[PDB]
Amino acid sequence: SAVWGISVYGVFVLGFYIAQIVFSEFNRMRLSDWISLRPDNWNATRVAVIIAGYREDPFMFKKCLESVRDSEYGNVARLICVIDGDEEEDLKMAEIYKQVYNDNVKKPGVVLCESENKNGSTIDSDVSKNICILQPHRGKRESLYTGFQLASMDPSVHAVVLIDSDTVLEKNAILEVVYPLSCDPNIKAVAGECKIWNTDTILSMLVSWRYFSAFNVERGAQSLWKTVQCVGGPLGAYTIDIINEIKDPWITQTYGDDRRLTNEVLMRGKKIVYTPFAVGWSDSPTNVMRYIVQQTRWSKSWCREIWYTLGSAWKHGFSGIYLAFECMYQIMYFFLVMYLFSYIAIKADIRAQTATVLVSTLVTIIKSSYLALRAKNLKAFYFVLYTYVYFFCMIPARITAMFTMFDWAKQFLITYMWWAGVLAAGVYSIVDNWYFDWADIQYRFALVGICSYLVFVSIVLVIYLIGKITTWNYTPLQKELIEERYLH
């Protein structure tokens, strides 16, 4: 049972990816239709911008604040900056705010969520000036709670745009997140595109293309039915009413923020869309260990919150069938990959190992071809290398999350165990198939296929090295940031 196992895997992956591509294109066409017919110089939704940061890089924080200040939206109420501060080290972010914005820092002795009076009037008196708050260190959820309280006590704000402390918005990023809120009276959240800008390392470039795929294909496919599972942290928008209703359960229930908020909007039976015309530039980890740690946390959150999307699907009627199927697909893909690798490793057949390798390479090449076509970029073919990352940085993270949820230490022991198992399986296959036979056509196929695959991967890596030598891999924003940081 080998041919069926590979053909089923190939169909199960590529057909769903193509369906996601088609749904994403339909969503993008609908959003482009919405953007057209919009009056020129449109500003109707009064917007409160909320930034939550904790010991941010001063340069990136200044860039984020200046990108907010340079935005071309004419109906922004004020900027609410909330810091897990109150300390001496966290005063540098306050000083940066003061040098870009008002000198309106407030240092209350308490966090709003822990008090018998949760109104923002105890810390705010003027709803006009941009405000900076130095909270005691409690967490992202508490700072977002203070932001919600400060934004919701002004009876004119209609929506809140939540951004991170490292995102560099484009001049029309704010305009393109708060416009879809005005197109359907059931849309309560909107997610914007997040783009990775620091593509100066191979891991960073692969993660950038993974982000491009996960936003412009997966999130677009989700948004065609208006059931986006996660609103991106770097750039999101929520109506103020849904914030008022879902804020309290979200704060009296760690890293599930922007995923539990989206989940609360989903169990309320409200719709969420994703717009690809709102771009926020964030960064990605350049280290394998930190990437694995972040993915372990994300997988913990995903397996913790997937059981709520599957019980709240019926609220959406028949549009939740896609949500349930996507959850089932994400569950079964991991098991399919694990079982397929185990079978190919244990059986140790060269003509099946080569077939699996070549089929996977062809599927990834097709995905990268579409990514290059959509992005109008020739660097998207670098995505053909991402199959390594998922195998060597995502499987151990998912296993660790699973073995933590219902059970170095635990974090960095399953990673080395997985790597040792993979290396042992490879060595076992090579040692079990050590012979040369140029008369056999099947051996010729296997050897030529494996040599062609290694040649192709080496050519791609050499192209990456040449591109990195000439600094051709760098995004234009990355070159601008390098020059500006040199100037500082």
Partner: nanobody, 124 residues
Framework: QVQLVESGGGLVQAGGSLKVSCAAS????????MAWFRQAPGKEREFVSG???????YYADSVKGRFTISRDNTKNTVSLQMDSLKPEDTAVYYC??????????????????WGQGTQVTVSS
């Protein structure tokens, strides 16, 4: 290394069926290409059939649709079933093995390990 011992064969009239199996004792009967060769009193050794390590079967021009070769890696035995043993089958059958080789698999020099052979006779 692989040591091969033949078994089977004997006196079968013209038209009957027979089976000859060579048992190979060695480390890995999984990557060894096997072949059978016949030496006749009035002829020389020549290739009659063979099977590769990936279960690819090659047959001679004269025995293309006569014999059937199979291998068993558990008991370490490769067997050849002959049907309709007409004349010219009165020969000694040798079982040969080879792990590394090239495009030439018919010349007796290609195969490294050779057996002692089993005699097969046919009476008209």
């Amino acid at each position: 290394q692989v040591q091969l011992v033949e078994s089977g064969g004997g006196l079968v009239q013209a038209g009957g069926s027979l089976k000859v199996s060579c048992a190979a004792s060695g480390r890995a009967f999984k990557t060894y290409r096997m072949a059978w060769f016949r030496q006749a009193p009035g002829k020389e050794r020549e290739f009659v059939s063979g099977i590769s390590a990936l279960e690819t079967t090659y047959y001679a021009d004269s025995v293309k649709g006569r014999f059937t070769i199979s291998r068993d890696n558990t008991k370490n035995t490769v067997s050849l079933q002959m049907d309709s043993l007409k004349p010219e089958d009165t020969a000694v059958y040798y079982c040969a093995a080879r792990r590394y080789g090239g495009t030439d698999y018919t010349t007796t020099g290609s195969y490294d390990y050779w057996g002692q052979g089993t005699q097969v006779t046919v009476s008209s």
